[PDB]
Every structure is written in structure tokens, then in C-alpha cells.
């Protein structure tokens, strides 16, 4: 009937036309209102292949979120290419809202309902919908924030789990709250519950062993790169936070290790930078100092971006470090169960 094709999609949202917050403002003209009663139909006796890594929806979304950022957060100075841009750079309200993606007439979105679907392969329970669920376009590295959670078990998704050049997306079942605050007016910090976080690492390790074998799993910090990827970087209240995750990724998990082994709070030191490397584009951007007052944004940890060290193959252990930087992987973590077809 149908056959795979890529085309230009549109977005839908419940944005408020009166709001000054920039996601709302963009979505008010860029997207349509959500459907009160979205329809999902089970496709009886239908089996379908998905590939979350070659899904053009991600790229379309990417170009959209770039555009959203460009027209919302104007830097005092931009160095894209060899050309430098000076301009007015006012403070704005910036807090993500959910976005749904929908197919126009003649096209459709298929949705895999298989438990813990890895994103590549045959789905046994396929449905059709007119629109996706609402996805908040949270821009961050290392940790995925405010995303979707796995239903039953932690899920690992990779193009080649044994290819150390490939990113590894992890999806949790239970979310981990992260609480950040700004009281050197650039100094800040984020708290996560130690006990809550360690239980998480134990279960992630166990899941990872199913792919790499009955081996010791080590979590360590980033080996290098720009601060945006060597720290947990994200934005809050229009301000760019950069948080040290050394306290998070500094553990060794044997096959028999449990969080119970050997305040209950891990405090991560953070910094607010005005000079940042853009994710949209190669180049540097400079913003205005941070606005006065207490800045807070409590978030839900919903996923991880990891890489695995290479080397001369050696049983016993594997070492993993936080990564990211390509925001398409953030989008993939939400769009994995969808694909576009033409009718």
C-alpha cells in the first residue's frame, strides 16, 4: 500500500498566544492547536520495521528547534563562520512546552507499541495515529531531561552497541529529580538524591551487561572536549547552566555489586557562562550577564547519553562515560517509535 518517503511535516501545540515566554511565542505562529481526542488504531496482523537512527522526522525537528532558538535567544555576539555579529541581546523568558508532530493529508505516522522496543527491527504491535504525543524540546547534554520514560525496563538504543563511535541512548523507568539553584554571581549547583541515583546506576549496569556480556561495568567522567559536553549543560530561565557530573560518574559495578554496598545527597558544582559554543551550528555566542534573583528549575532525569571506551579488547570490564552534543539524539529518544510513510 504505502511505501517509505520523507516529506515536510508541521507541528502542533497548546501554546498560549498571550504568553511572553519564547517557546509559546514561536509555537503560536509555527504550530496548530492539539486534538482533544487523538485517534490511535491498532493495525491487525501488521508487522513493520523501524529505524530510529534513519528517521527524517528527527532532522525536520532539528531544523525547527534551531529556528526556535535563533529567533528567541539573540546573543550579543555571534561567531558563525569567519563572520562576527554584534547586536542587541535582551533577556527573555525561556521554558520549553510540549510539541506534537503530525502528518498532513496523504501521509501517516506509525507507532510501535512493543514493550522496550530498541528502535531498529520488526515491531509486532503497530498502530496508526494522526499526531505524535507531546514532546518538550529540552536542549541538554549528558542527561536527557523532561523526556519520555520506558514502561517496564530500562532500554538501550544503539546503531551498533559494539561500535565505540556510536552514541548510546539510555531510557529510565523511574525518573531522578534534579534540583538546581543560583544563590561570584555566576556560581550555582544542582542536587540529586544519592540513594535514588545509585539504585538507578545498579539497574542500568545490569541492563548493559545483557549486551556486553557477564562483565564488570564502570562509569567514569568525560575524557575531554568542550565544556558543553564534558559537563551536564542545559538552559534555565534563559540562562545557560554548566554542571559537573564527576560526582555522578565515578563508580565501578561488579556483577554482584548493589547500591547498598560499603543527608543522602550528591551536590554537583555548576557554572553559568556567557560565552558558549552553539549546538545549532559551529561557532561561538556571547550573552548578557545573568538576571538578578534566585534561579531554579527542578527537572526529571529521563535518560542518558553514553559512549564506551575503545582499546585492545580485554574481557573483565567495560568503561562508560557521559557524552552527547548532537541534539538529534535527544529527539531520537522521543521519536524512535514513529516513522513517516506516504499513502
Amino acid at each position, epitope marked *: 500500500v504505502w511505501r517509505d518517503a520523507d516529506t515536510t511535516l508541521f507541528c502542533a501545540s497548546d501554546a498560549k498566544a498571550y504568553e511572553t515566554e519564547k517557546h509559546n511565542v514561536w509555537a503560536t505562529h509555527a504550530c496548530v492547536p492539539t486534538d482533544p481526542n487523538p485517534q490511535e488504531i491498532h493495525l491487525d496482523n501488521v508487522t513493520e520495521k523501524f529505524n530510529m537512527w534513519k528517521n527524517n522526522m528527527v532532522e525536520q525537528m532539528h531544523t525547527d528547534i534551531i529556528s526556535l532558538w535563533d529567533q528567541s535567544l539573540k546573543p550579543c555576539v555571534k561567531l558563525t563562520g569567519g563572520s562576527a555579529i554584534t547586536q542587541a541581546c535582551p533577556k527573555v523568558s525561556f521554558e520549553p512546552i510540549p510539541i506534537h508532530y503530525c502528518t498532513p493529508a496523504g501521509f501517516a505516522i506509525l507507532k510501535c507499541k512493543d514493550e522496550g522496543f530498541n528502535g531498529t527491527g520488526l515491531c509486532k504491535n503497530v498502530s496508526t495515529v494522526q499526531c505524535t504525543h507531546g514532546i518538550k524540546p529540552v536542549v541538554s547534554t549528558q542527561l536527557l531531561l523532561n523526556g519520555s520514560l520506558a514502561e517496564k525496563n530500562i532500554t538501550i538504543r544503539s546503531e551498533n552497541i559494539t561500535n565505540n563511535a556510536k552514541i548510546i541512548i539510555v531510557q529510565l523507568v523511574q525518573p531522578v529529580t534534579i534540583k538546581c539553584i543560583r544563590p561570584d554571581i555566576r556560581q550555582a549547583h544542582c542536587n540529586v538524591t544519592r540513594s535514588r541515583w545509585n539504585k538507578t546506576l545498579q539497574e542500568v549496569a545490569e541492563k548493559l551487561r545483557t549486551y556486553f556480556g557477564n562483565k564488570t561495568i564502570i562509569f567514569a567522567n568525560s575524557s575531554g572536549g568542550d565544556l558543553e559536553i564534558t559537563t551536564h549543560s542545559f538552559n534555565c530561565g534563559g540562562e545557560f547552566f554548566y554542571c559537573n557530573t564527576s560526582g555522578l560518574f565515578n563508580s565501578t559495578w561488579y556483577v554482584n555489586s548493589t547500591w547498598n554496598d560499603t543527608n543522602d545527597t550528591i551536590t554537583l558544582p555548576c557554572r553559568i557562562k556567557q560565552i558558549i559554543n552553539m549546538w545549532q551550528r559551529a561557532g561561538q555566542a556571547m550573552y548578557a550577564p545573568p538576571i538578578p534573583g534566585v534561579i531554579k528549575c527542578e527537572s526529571n532525569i529521563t535518560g542518558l547519553l553514553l*559512549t564506551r571506551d575503545g582499546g*585492545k*579488547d580485554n574481557n573483565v570490564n567495560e568503561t562508560f562515560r557521559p557524552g552527547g552534543g548532537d541534539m538529534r539524539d535527544n529527539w531520537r529518544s522521543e521519536l524512535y517509535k514513529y516513522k513517516v510513510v506516504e499513502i
Partner: antibody
Amino acid sequence: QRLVQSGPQVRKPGSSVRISCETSGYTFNAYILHWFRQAPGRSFEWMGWIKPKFGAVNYAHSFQGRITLTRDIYRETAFLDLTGLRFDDTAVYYCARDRLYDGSSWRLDPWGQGTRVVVSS
Amino acid sequence: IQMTQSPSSLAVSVGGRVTITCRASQGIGSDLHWYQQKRGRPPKILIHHASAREEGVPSRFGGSGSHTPFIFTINDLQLDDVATYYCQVIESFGQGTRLDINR
């Protein structure tokens, strides 16, 4: 596509050396770059890759703590740092681009002319 | 992930059909690539994805096989083909085959 490397350098044991890999001819940000050394006669050894856009790096095995891969985003030059230069590190070092646009396949089409490194006290 | 390349050396005169075999750790599918380097020169891709050829050198060069073993074949050897050959899977390289002419 074309990758020119640094000239031959000779350093003393214990010191450190930096090798550059000048990039022209292709999209510098959308191609995973790898680093290899080749012992006199022996086959190639993998040292580590580095995704240029964010300097996202991956060192390897016995190199960790001795190697650092960086890039200068402008002038598009990539670097390879080698600290605590042992005698047996004397080799020729290579940089080679993964052919696959946006992704990895470990196909290595353009290669450096080879940076000859000698470690002699 | 772990390579074993036979033979370590070899010597065939101009014309003889050459065959190199690379065996590895369990399963790698089709992700084995084939190189070639001359004295004092950096290597060059010849065959990728276990079977496929690439632009440049002729298609008298070839490869076939699946799973664990693979074969690299030169149907009609010339004079400038005399070089060392290597098989590679991601981070892992073959030991290397030093080609030669017979005499």
C-alpha cells in the same frame, strides 16, 4: 578531501609531543576523525577518535592519561598530544577521516602523509 | 575486534590470482574493510562492507564471504600492486600480508 599532517619531529623520553592534522576539502564538522600509529614494520594501532564539532573524544587502552585529542575549530586543524614519551612510542602517526557523512562506518579514505616521531635521549 | 590474517607473507609473479583470508573473533557480519600500503606511504581503502568495491582502483579487486571468514582477491596481478595488504574491522587491524613477486 585532504589531510595534511605535521612534519617529522624528534623528542626526548619523558617529554611531550604535539601532532597536527590540517583539514581541507570537506565538511570538517560532519566527519569522525581517527588516529593511528604504525610501529616500524608492525601493523596499525588505534589510538582514538574525535568528533570535531564538540571535540567529543575517545581515547583507548594504554593510551589513556598519555594522549589528548583536540581540534582548533577555526583553521579546522586537529591535534594529537602524547605525554610521557616512552622509547617504544617511536613510530609514524596517522590521522584518517571516516568516509561516512553523519555517522560511523570506519571507512578511512583520506590519510595523513604520516608524522615520523623518534623518541631518543 | 580481533584479527588473524593469512598468510603473513606471500610471493606471486605478475598475473597469478592471489587470495588472502582474514578470520576473526565470532561474528562481524560484513563490516570488514581492505587496505593497501606501499613503502613509505599511507594505506588506501580498496574494498569495504566485505564485498563492495569503491571508486578508484579497478574491480579486478574483490572480496566475498560472511560471518567469521573473508577473502580478498586479485584476479590479475600487475606490477604496481606489489604492496602490503591489511584487513580491518573498526578498531582492529589484520597482522598484514607482505606481497611479493616470484623468482
